[PDB]
Amino acid sequence: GVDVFEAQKNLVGKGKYLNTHVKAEDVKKDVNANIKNQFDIAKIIAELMGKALKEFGNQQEGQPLSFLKVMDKVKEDFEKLFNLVRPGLGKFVKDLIQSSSQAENKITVYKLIFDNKKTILNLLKELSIPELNSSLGLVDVLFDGITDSDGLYERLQSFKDLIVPAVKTNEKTAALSPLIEELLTQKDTYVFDLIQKHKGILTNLLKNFLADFQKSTPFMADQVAIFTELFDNEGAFDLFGEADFVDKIAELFLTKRTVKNGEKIETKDSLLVTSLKSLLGEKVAALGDLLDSYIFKNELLNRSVEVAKAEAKDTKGATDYKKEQAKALKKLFKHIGENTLSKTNLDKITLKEVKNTENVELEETETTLKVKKLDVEYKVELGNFEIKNGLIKAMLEFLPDTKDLETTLDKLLFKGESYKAMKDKYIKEGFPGYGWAKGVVPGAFESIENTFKSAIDKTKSIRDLFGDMLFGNDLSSVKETDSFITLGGSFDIKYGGENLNVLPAYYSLINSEIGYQIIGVDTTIDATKVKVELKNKEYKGKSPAINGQVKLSQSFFNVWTNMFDSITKQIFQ
Amino acid sequence: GVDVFEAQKNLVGKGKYLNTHVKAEDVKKDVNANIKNQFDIAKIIAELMGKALKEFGNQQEGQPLSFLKVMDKVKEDFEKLFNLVRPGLGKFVKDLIQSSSQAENKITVYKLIFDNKKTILNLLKELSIPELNSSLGLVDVLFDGITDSDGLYERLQSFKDLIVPAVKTNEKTAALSPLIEELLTQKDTYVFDLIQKHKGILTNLLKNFLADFQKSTPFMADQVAIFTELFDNEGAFDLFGEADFVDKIAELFLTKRTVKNGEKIETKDSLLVTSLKSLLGEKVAALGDLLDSYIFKNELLNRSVEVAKAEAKDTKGATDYKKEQAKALKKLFKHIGENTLSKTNLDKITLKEVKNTENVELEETETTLKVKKLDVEYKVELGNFEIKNGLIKAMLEFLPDTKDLETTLDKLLFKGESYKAMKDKYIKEGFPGYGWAKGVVPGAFESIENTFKSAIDKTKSIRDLFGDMLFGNDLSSVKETDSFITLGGSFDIKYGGENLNVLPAYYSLINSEIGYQIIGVDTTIDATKVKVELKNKEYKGKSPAINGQVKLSQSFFNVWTNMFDSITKQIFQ
């Protein structure tokens, strides 16, 4: 055949395939449907985590709820999602997430495969590896003369005597040999049961794929790093089985790791802490110690495995941080599910067409196909997307509630590396103009510290300080139903261009299904005309943590408000 | 004759004049008497200001007491002083200070001159000007055949017909012509009456002499500068007449000057302020503003002439600062007279001989005369020279008692030239490590100033602050009878040398009286073994001016104590 560019010699032209098979009305409708489907899949994704998250959060303590038992409660949504990402991929995913022991209605792997065979063929042809096509040449021969999944199972059992030696002899699939084994051994195979049962091999391939992606995608290196750290444990595949997702995600992502056997590497911390260390590498330094005392040393984010049964050995209520952290995660899931990403809250985000009338004329001249003038604009109206108090109040509750705020703030402000140097320099000499007054100095940098220390309320923790910084008013006096951040207005999408080339777009492997791509589309996301307003822009607190004549919680809140306005002016629109 | 060095050819030698007229016992006794007489004249000077100062201070308000009416009350002391500075100069000064209208027993100029004619001859021969000897050639002829002052007056009247044309024709004495005029016109001439009556001419010669001394003595330029500024006014000679010294010294030394007539130069300030400006030129800069608000702008040191009758025009009690300042000066004189430089307090300073036994052998060999081995040592035992509270408490009372201490200290500390620059720099950017927290800065350098300002007691003035800095305890609770500084121990004087040349020493002019001088005497003043102790080395105050958690009056007091110890370790012994 013709690889990628000898194809674009007999496929486009004056009256050749692409030009005569792509119409101006077709181009216009597909361009509009591109934005429409992107918005629709974004909305379905947002509601999906917000329909499953509500079930996660509302689950009672001590009652396990797996990652897949909740998948059924949103199964249709997945279908919708995946019937909008790719036409025809609606039954496959809805069947896939029902192919597990935790699903309400089990369906076998053979039922999963025979029904949506064409969709599986497209997905396999979309894989980046060429060699898979060698295994794809017998799929049509495999599915010939088959009317039900039972016949497919029988024919695969007949062909096993040739399939399994080829799999074993291939070094790439040599480790895979057990998998396909029971794919021909039991008629009641389930994809997710296999995934949770073949933990080691699947983790090995996942680690290799993630390492390859890291070597290929340095820009998202943090996400691949956290994924690899997650999948370094075989038990990380217990999510796709009979487990508790609201607990497994806590013991995988918010729990210290000891994945080694030499002497001890238990100091590996948690996944979230390592991700914060990577993402806050050197952006902030002085407050990093704060992160060391409140973010890197909290049992709700760093559960400190094997240390709970070290000094107590009696299981106190506070000692067991595996359920308090699970409760905090469940509360966060509750709020993100039914208060932020709910159907009602997501309903006030409307993608309205603006012009959608101009005809996208196509000009053909020899081996070319260009769009005369593409100009479509869609207004995404954010309505009033009330991010209520609780999306960030739950994250505040993740922070420890230890009342020891004086010592931590003293260490952060005064017992630092820069303030101490200035202290010493002013003690030995200094105070310009005065000079001879050196005994005054250890009476000057002592009340300067003393008033700051005495301002800090003895009964307020870092939760209260962060509530003053963000909410303004005190946490106990801040209503969870109020909106912390409200998104209003609308932002424009301005797909545009002149003389834009239209060229054939193929799948990853050899396939008879082809699309077309318009290259060089100026996709201007004019994010202006949106207002990300802090509803609590004034300090309403009555018992500030650092109140007094040296009120810093109010100053910190004003700093937060100003920095939020700056972020919404530069990072946003 | 032989000028200075051809004289030291026939005056010293083997058996020549100086060698055969100066004995080893004579050298020893004169060397011992040098230290003894220096100590004695120092003690008599100290008691003199301390016997006259007591009379100055104890004088009631509104009763004038001239500089010379008190001179009589100590007249004998002057004689003692001046009979120890130079033998025979005992009757002359005691007669001189009685030759005024303010003296209790008036004596004429002729009585002053004929009696101690020889002493006047020595003093005139001690004047630096050579030409005076031309007028000294007729003194012996003038005093021939005279038995009383009446005969001297008659002979000067006879010789006036030749004396006064010579005085008039001489340009140097041309301005002097009126003076000698009444020196032959009235038989009841008084030296100090003439001095106070011939103000202009005497001020002119004094100004010329002081300018010459300034051109000759740059090291004591400040003293000559204040003297010239003092004598720039003719009325400055009103001290030697019918006036009030405790008031005249206040209106000459602690009063603004307006000595000009062009438009106005009243901003010339006082003599003490100008002397402080010269002596505190650039040693202290930041606290100079303090001196601007409390030392340069106080009516007790800068009386602000012609401004009292400018805005009030009703003579309020506080407005008339000419008697409040006079009262403060009288209180200081009272304390220095009968508490610090009293006879009882000065009695505990003993000059004791240590060895005073070694013979000062003299070796003569050709034109030389050397001391074989001079070694005398005298111990000055300071006893307990209690400088009581009041030598410095009165000077504290000279400072204004305005309760406005907050504004002045705020200007000195915060509203300065260096703190404001740091303020601006930290406001625009800064706070290293933080960076993004710029709104916190106008909440940081606001309590830093606020606590310092709030510490300052509203009812305490600079007098109280200086009392805390120096005395420790509050001024109202500090007893004036207690000793601020006590001098104890003793210091040694170690006149020494080997092979020290002894050569003739002559007067300023041609004279028949000659002394001898030993050159190169190592006069080691070993000031060690003395203890200048602050009796109040601990803060006993109960109402400090800057009390609180930012106690600065206590810190200032500790700084003062440490700096006093440093001064007594380096400036002292």
UniProtKB/Swiss-Prot annotation, chains A, B:
Main localisation: membrane
Cellular compartments per GO CC: membrane
Domain of life: Bacteria
Sorted UniProt keywords: Membrane, Transmembrane, Transmembrane helix
Topological relation to the membrane, as annotated: Single-pass membrane protein
Subcellular location: Membrane
Protein name: Uncharacterized protein MG075 homolog
